[PDB]
Amino acid sequence: MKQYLELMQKVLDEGTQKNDRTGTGTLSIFGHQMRFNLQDGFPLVTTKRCHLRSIIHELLWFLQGDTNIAYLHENNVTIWDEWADENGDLGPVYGKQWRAWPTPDGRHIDQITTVLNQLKNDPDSRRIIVSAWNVGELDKMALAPCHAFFQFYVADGKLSCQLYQRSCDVFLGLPFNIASYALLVHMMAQQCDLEVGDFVWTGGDTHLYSNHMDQTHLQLSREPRPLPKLIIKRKPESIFDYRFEDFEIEGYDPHPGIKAP
Amino acid sequence: MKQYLELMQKVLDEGTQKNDRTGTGTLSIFGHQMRFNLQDGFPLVTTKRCHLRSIIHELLWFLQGDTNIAYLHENNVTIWDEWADENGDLGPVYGKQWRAWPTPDGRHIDQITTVLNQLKNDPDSRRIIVSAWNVGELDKMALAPCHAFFQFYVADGKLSCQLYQRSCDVFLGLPFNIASYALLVHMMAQQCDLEVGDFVWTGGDTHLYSNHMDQTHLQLSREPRPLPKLIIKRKPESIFDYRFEDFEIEGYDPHPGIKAPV
Numbered sequence: 214m215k216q217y218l219e220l221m222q223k224v225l226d227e228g229t230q231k232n233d234r235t236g237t238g239t240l241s242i243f244g245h246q247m248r249f250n251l252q253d254g255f256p257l258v259t260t261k262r263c264h265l266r267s268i269i270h271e272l273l274w275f276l277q278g279d280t281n282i283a284y285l286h287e288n289n290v291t292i293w294d295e296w297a298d299e300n301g302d303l304g305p306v307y308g309k310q311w312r313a314w315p316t317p318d319g320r321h322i323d324q325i326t327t328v329l330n331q332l333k334n335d336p337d338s339r340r341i342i343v344s345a346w347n348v349g350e351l352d353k354m355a356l357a358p359c360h361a362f363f364q365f366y367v368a369d370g371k372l373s374c375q376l377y378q379r380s381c382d383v384f385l386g387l388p389f390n391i392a393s394y395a396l397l398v399h400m401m402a403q404q405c406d407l408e409v410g411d412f413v414w415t416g417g418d419t420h421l422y423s424n425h426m427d428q429t430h431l432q433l434s435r436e437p438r439p440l441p442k443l444i445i446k447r448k449p450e451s452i453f454d455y456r457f458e459d460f461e462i463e464g465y466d467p468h469p470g471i472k473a474p
Numbered sequence: 475m476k477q478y479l480e481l482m483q484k485v486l487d488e489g490t491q492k493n494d495r496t497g498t499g500t501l502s503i504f505g506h507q508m509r510f511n512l513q514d515g516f517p518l519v520t521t522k523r524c525h526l527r528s529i530i531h532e533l534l535w536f537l538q539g540d541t542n543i544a545y546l547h548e549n550n551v552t553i554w555d556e557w558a559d560e561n562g563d564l565g566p567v568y569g570k571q572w573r574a575w576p577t578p579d580g581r582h583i584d585q586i587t588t589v590l591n592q593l594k595n596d597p598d599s600r601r602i603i604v605s606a607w608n609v610g611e612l613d614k615m616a617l618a619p620c621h622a623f624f625q626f627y628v629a630d631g632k633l634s635c636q637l638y639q640r641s642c643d644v645f646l647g648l649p650f651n652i653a654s655y656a657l658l659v660h661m662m663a664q665q666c667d668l669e670v671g672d673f674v675w676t677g678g679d680t681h682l683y684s685n686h687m688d689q690t691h692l693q694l695s696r697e698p699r700p701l702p703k704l705i706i707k708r709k710p711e712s713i714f715d716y717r718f719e720d721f722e723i724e725g726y727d728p729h730p731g732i733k734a735p736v
């Protein structure tokens with residue numbers, strides 16, 4: 214995608230060399246922002262084939278508030294496998310915070326249900342937010358949230374969303390995360406009877422891993438193609454009732470996928 | 475400042491006309507990002523006179539974990555007065571969250587002490603963050619946080635900081651908030667023996683209130699002056715021991731103050 218390809222190139226040209234906790238190096242920058250007008254097409258990177266299948270199952274798993282990978286396993290999604298414990302648990306990562314943020318008095322807060330009621334009853338609210346950054350539960354998580362907080366906004370019947378991504382693997386994670394949130398916006402817009410607006414992506418520590426440089430050079434020699442179009446084939450009863458077969462991507466014509474370690 | 479006037483101009487050229495929570499109309503954009511290299515100068519708006527006095531007191535108060543206006547009111551800082559209850563309490567706003575975020579198991583997390591230790595011992599960490607966005611306590615606060623979350627970053631011996639401001643009053647709030655965080659970056663950097671890098675500002679709902687329009691256009695007819703320079707006179711034993719008198723601004727030569735209703 215043009216903005217994506219400019220970000221890759223910016224890391225290459227201005228990133229500084231760092232070490233990470235794994236001893237693998239990176240090139241990184243701090244602070245970046247991109248905007249995707251979702252009416253221009255679904256923002257799925259076309260300079261490498263990206264499979265939506267795992268993206269879609271993970272989003273639906275998040276919305277059910279499940280943090281055990283059994284559901285992912287039933288549908289052959291393995292992106293979370295290395296962080297799960299012997300029981301398949303991740304601790305209270307994304308899903309748990311989205312649907313049942315734990316309060317000190319034993320109660321839970323459903324942030325998605327709050328956001329839907331804010332979109333439907335108070336769309337101009339300036340606090341239509343979902344945070345996964347539960348400071349009190351970071352030590353229990355298998356991984357601290359990378360797509361840490363997001364905010365919705367309504368203008369002229371269009372639903373926009375901005376994501377603050379505190380840590381971004383530009384090659385591997387970013388195309389996946391852009392798609393995931395673009396999808397959620399389409400689903401929310403549909404449940405609130407709104408049109409789709411912008412997906413604003415803001416990065417904190419934004420990097421390219423050292424072992425992703427050949428792959429990055431390959432990707433930057435390719436030209437982007439027109440974006441595909443998302444089709445939701447069935448409008449369910451609520452935001453918690455989507456199924457994998459409700460989504461279709463049309464006109465997706467990417468270059469061959471690029472594998473990365 | 476250049477970045478600040480460019481944002482005002484973007485809100486006027488692109489913003490959507492809507493209404494705030496109390497009706498008071500707004501022009502708003504969604505999503506913005508700007509950067510201030512702190513080595514170029516302390517980012518205190520010059521196109522209207524801004525008083526650093528109150529910004530300093532507020533930050534020293536936040537850093538103590540205080541949420542009662544008494545310290546502010548004694549020092550003639552009245553910006554939080556309208557939100558305070560009859561006992562001067564604001565609820566567990568900013569400072570409480572920063573210094574003692576309450577966990578489910580009964581612990582409290584001191585996010586400022588954590589970030590200081592992560593800057594001294596693991597400066598390349600990708601989670602050197604402070605969040606005031608405590609979902610479980612938002613409705614106990616007098617106001618939900620507007621400068622909601624911030625992250626630090628270290629490169630080439632310089633400390634940078636990015637703030638996510640979910641709701642931004644561009645004319646009244648923003649000049650204050652930029653100066654507040656640039657001061658925090660300076661304090662933290664001093665404490666970790668680092669040099670200052672960039673303050674990165676990101677906005678969510680970024681608006682101009684309709685009754686600030688003539689003031690905004692007035693300000694937009696002026697040229698930004700050279701940035702003032704911040705002199706910290708002492709190196710306290712910790713980030714929690716700074717005093718009002720440790721801070722001096724030099725070379726501040728602003729255009730006239732422009733009053734406006736909150």
Ligand SMILES: *SCCNC(=O)[C@H]1CCCN1S(=O)(=O)c1ccc(C)cc1
Pocket residue numbers: 292293356359380381382385386389390
């Ligand atoms: S800061 C990145 C840390 N890793 C993650 O959070 C992983 C765990 C599985 C989901 N995410 S991801 O960054 O969205 C991702 C998705 C797909 C691949 C191939 C890698 C990483």
Ligand SMILES: *SCCNC(=O)[C@H]1CCCN1S(=O)(=O)c1ccc(C)cc1
Pocket residue numbers: 553554617619620641642643646647648650651736
């Ligand atoms: S989203 C803005 C909501 N209002 C506030 O949080 C106020 C209360 C006092 C501090 N803040 S402020 O926006 O930083 C501010 C500071 C100074 C003035 C003159 C107005 C507002």
